[PDB]
C-alpha cells in the first residue's frame, strides 16, 4: 500500500544518493587527469540501472508518483553522466 509505496521510494533515494557519491568520486578522478578501472564504471552502470528498474517496479499514486519521478529523472542524469564517462576514460 501507500506507506509501503512511501518506504520503497525512500529507500531507493538513500541508495541512489551513495551511487551518486561513488559517480561524484569517479567523476573528480577521471576529470583531474587520474584513471578508473573499465569494469568499476560498468559495476556502477549495473546499480544504477537496478535501483532504475526497482523503482519502476514501485506503484503509486500522489506524491508517492511526484517523488519517484524526481528520483528516476535523478538517474537518468546520472545514467548519462555515466555514459560520458565511460567515453572519457576508455
Do not use: C, W
Not at 11 to 35: C, H, M, N, P, Y
Not at 45 to 60: C, F, H, P, R, Y
Not at 69 to 87: F, G, P, S, T, W
Request: charged content about 30%; glycine content about 8%; aromatic content about 4%.
Amino acid at each position: 500500500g501507500p506507506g509501503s509505496s512511501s518506504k520503497a521510494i525512500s529507500d531507493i533515494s538513500f541508495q541512489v544518493e551513495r551511487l551518486a557519491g561513488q559517480l561524484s568520486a569517479f567523476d573528480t578522478v577521471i576529470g583531474k587527469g587520474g584513471k578508473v578501472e573499465e569494469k568499476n564504471l560498468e559495476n556502477l552502470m549495473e546499480m544504477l540501472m537496478n535501483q532504475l528498474v526497482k523503482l519502476d517496479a514501485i506503484s503509486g499514486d500522489g506524491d508517492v508518483k511526484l517523488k519517484k519521478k524526481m528520483q528516476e529523472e535523478r538517474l537518468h542524469k546520472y545514467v548519462e553522466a555515466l555514459d560520458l564517462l565511460k567515453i572519457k576514460n576508455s
